[PDB]
Design an enzyme around this catalytic site. Structure first.
Site, short mmCIF file in Angstrom:
data_model
loop_
_atom_site.label_atom_id
_atom_site.label_comp_id
_atom_site.label_asym_id
_atom_site.label_seq_id
_atom_site.Cartn_x
_atom_site.Cartn_y
_atom_site.Cartn_z
N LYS A 46 0.81 -1.20 0.00
CA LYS A 46 0.00 0.00 0.00
C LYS A 46 0.85 1.26 0.00
CE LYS A 46 -3.41 2.36 2.97
NZ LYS A 46 -4.25 2.19 4.19
N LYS A 52 13.44 -1.20 0.22
CA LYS A 52 12.03 -0.86 0.29
C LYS A 52 11.82 0.60 -0.03
CE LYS A 52 7.93 -1.83 2.94
NZ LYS A 52 7.40 -2.70 4.04
N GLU A 109 16.98 -6.43 5.46
CA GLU A 109 17.54 -7.76 5.31
C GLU A 109 16.72 -8.46 4.23
OE1 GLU A 109 17.10 -9.92 8.92
OE2 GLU A 109 17.55 -11.88 8.04
N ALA A 131 15.02 -11.69 3.03
CA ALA A 131 14.53 -12.98 3.50
C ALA A 131 14.12 -13.77 2.24
CB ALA A 131 13.35 -12.77 4.43
N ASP A 168 -0.17 -5.85 17.09
CA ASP A 168 -0.64 -7.12 16.55
C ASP A 168 0.36 -7.65 15.51
OD1 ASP A 168 -1.65 -4.71 15.13
OD2 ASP A 168 -2.18 -6.23 13.63
N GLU A 184 1.19 -12.32 7.24
CA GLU A 184 1.63 -11.58 6.06
C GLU A 184 2.88 -10.75 6.34
OE1 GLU A 184 -1.33 -11.64 7.40
OE2 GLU A 184 -2.49 -12.74 5.91
N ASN A 185 3.13 -10.42 7.61
CA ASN A 185 4.29 -9.61 7.95
C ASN A 185 5.45 -10.40 8.55
OD1 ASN A 185 2.89 -7.30 7.09
ND2 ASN A 185 1.94 -7.07 9.12
C1 LIG Z 1 5.88 -5.00 -0.53
C2 LIG Z 1 6.23 -4.21 0.74
C3 LIG Z 1 5.72 -4.89 2.00
C4 LIG Z 1 4.47 -4.41 2.50
C5 LIG Z 1 3.88 -4.95 3.65
C6 LIG Z 1 4.53 -5.99 4.34
C7 LIG Z 1 5.78 -6.52 3.91
C8 LIG Z 1 6.40 -7.66 4.74
C9 LIG Z 1 6.26 -9.01 4.03
C10 LIG Z 1 6.38 -5.96 2.70
N1 LIG Z 1 7.64 -6.51 2.28
C11 LIG Z 1 8.94 -6.25 2.78
O1 LIG Z 1 9.12 -5.38 3.63
N2 LIG Z 1 9.98 -7.02 2.28
C12 LIG Z 1 11.30 -6.94 2.96
C13 LIG Z 1 11.87 -8.19 2.46
C14 LIG Z 1 11.11 -8.95 1.63
C15 LIG Z 1 9.83 -8.22 1.46
C16 LIG Z 1 11.93 -10.07 1.33
N3 LIG Z 1 11.65 -11.19 0.53
C17 LIG Z 1 10.46 -11.45 -0.22
O2 LIG Z 1 9.51 -10.68 -0.25
C18 LIG Z 1 10.39 -12.77 -0.97
C19 LIG Z 1 9.21 -13.11 -1.72
C20 LIG Z 1 9.07 -14.32 -2.42
C21 LIG Z 1 10.12 -15.29 -2.43
N4 LIG Z 1 9.98 -16.55 -3.15
C22 LIG Z 1 11.11 -17.53 -3.29
C23 LIG Z 1 10.67 -19.02 -3.31
N5 LIG Z 1 9.46 -19.32 -4.18
C24 LIG Z 1 9.77 -20.29 -5.24
C25 LIG Z 1 8.76 -18.15 -4.76
C26 LIG Z 1 8.67 -16.94 -3.80
C27 LIG Z 1 11.31 -14.96 -1.68
C28 LIG Z 1 11.43 -13.73 -0.98
N6 LIG Z 1 13.11 -9.96 1.98
N7 LIG Z 1 13.05 -8.81 2.65
#
Ligand SMILES: CCc1cccc(CC)c1NC(=O)n1cc2c(c1)/C(=N\C(=O)c1ccc(N3CCN(C)CC3)cc1)N=N2
Length: 256
Positions: A17, A36, A85, A87, A130, A134-135
């Site tokens: 968002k 980000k 970082e 992940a 909370d 998803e986070n």
């Molecule tokens: C988009 C911005 C956002 C908004 C709200 C909450 C969040 C936290 C998740 C975030 N993301 C965030 O901060 N992010 C910081 C991050 C981050 C997101 C991240 N990795 C991934 O998103 C990811 C996705 C799919 C993945 N796959 C590999 C294996 N499979 C074969 C397919 C899929 C591997 C890694 N590492 N740091």
């Protein structure tokens, strides 16, 4: 003193968002991380810009294996950049959809990891709100990482509902652990209902049931965490020492 020029920005990892995340390599250290990009306009539109500024501040002082690391951050006229970082295994939510539901070992281990991280923050006078699946991100070794930034450190005319929110703040994550534990084992939230309204009532009246396959140890822990009264909820330490958790967790519980 960061700048976008310090990074080799690669593929998108997700859109949210408030911003987008991209995979990146720091030119200097040839270190892989996640960039980000947050849109100030979106943050202001929701009046959270000031809030984030303070959360990022707190985070920059948190160092824990189960807390997504914040390496640094900067900004420009219309954007806020977070160097995070990377992940590589995605979110817990995605993994749960993929497997339908987790077994006791997986569940207990994740719960311990969250409790260990929250316990550590508690000892630094930092509290968490909370927690949603998803986070939660997963590291290369499968360790879970809290990645939202929900950290933090008249009354006479306000009603209970509007006040009880701002008090006993240190008990909100306990309720969340209970909800996460239930969802990890069952595959769906305990108060999930058909409508927005229905869900409210369920949570408020604290009414939910356990599928037959949920063992006794897990029912005990979840029931103690999902109590309407915040003061009735256990301490993080009690969670880390609960018989069901210690028996099934593969990760050593480390309180404080
Ligand atoms: C988009 C911005 C956002 C908004 C709200 C909450 C969040 C936290 C998740 C975030 N993301 C965030 O901060 N992010 C910081 C991050 C981050 C997101 C991240 N990795 C991934 O998103 C990811 C996705 C799919 C993945 N796959 C590999 C294996 N499979 C074969 C397919 C899929 C591997 C890694 N590492 N740091």
């Amino acid at each position: 003193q960061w700048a976008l020029e310090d990074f080799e920005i690669g593929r998108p990892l997700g859109k949210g968002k408030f911003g987008n995340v991209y995979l990146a390599r720091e030119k200097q250290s040839k270190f892989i991380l996640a960039l980000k990009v947050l849109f100030k306009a979106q943050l202001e539109k929701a009046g959270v810009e000031h809030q984030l500024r303070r959360e990022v501040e707190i985070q920059s002082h948190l160092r824990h294996p189960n807390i997504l690391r914040l390496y640094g951050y900067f900004h420009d006229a219309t954007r806020v950049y977070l160097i995070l970082e990377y992940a590589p295994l995605g979110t817990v939510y995605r993994e749960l959809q993929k497997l339908s539901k987790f077994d006791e070992q997986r569940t207990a281990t994740y719960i311990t990891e969250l409790a260990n991280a929250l316990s550590y923050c508690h000892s630094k006078r930092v509290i968490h709100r909370d927690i949603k699946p998803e986070n939660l991100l997963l590291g290369s070794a499968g360790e879970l990482k809290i990645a939202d930034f929900g950290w933090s450190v008249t009354l006479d005319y306000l009603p209970p509902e509007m006040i009880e929110g701002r008090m006993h703040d240190e008990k909100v994550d306990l309720w969340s652990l209970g909800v996460l534990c239930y969802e990890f084992l069952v595959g769906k939230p305990p108060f999930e209902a058909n409508t927005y309204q229905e869900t409210y009532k369920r949570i408020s009246r604290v009414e939910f049931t356990f599928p037959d396959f949920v063992t006794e140890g897990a029912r005990d822990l979840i029931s103690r965490l999902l109590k309407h009264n915040p003061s009735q909820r256990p301490m993080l330490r009690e969670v880390l020492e609960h018989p069901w958790i210690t028996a099934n967790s593969s990760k050593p519980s480390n309180c404080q």
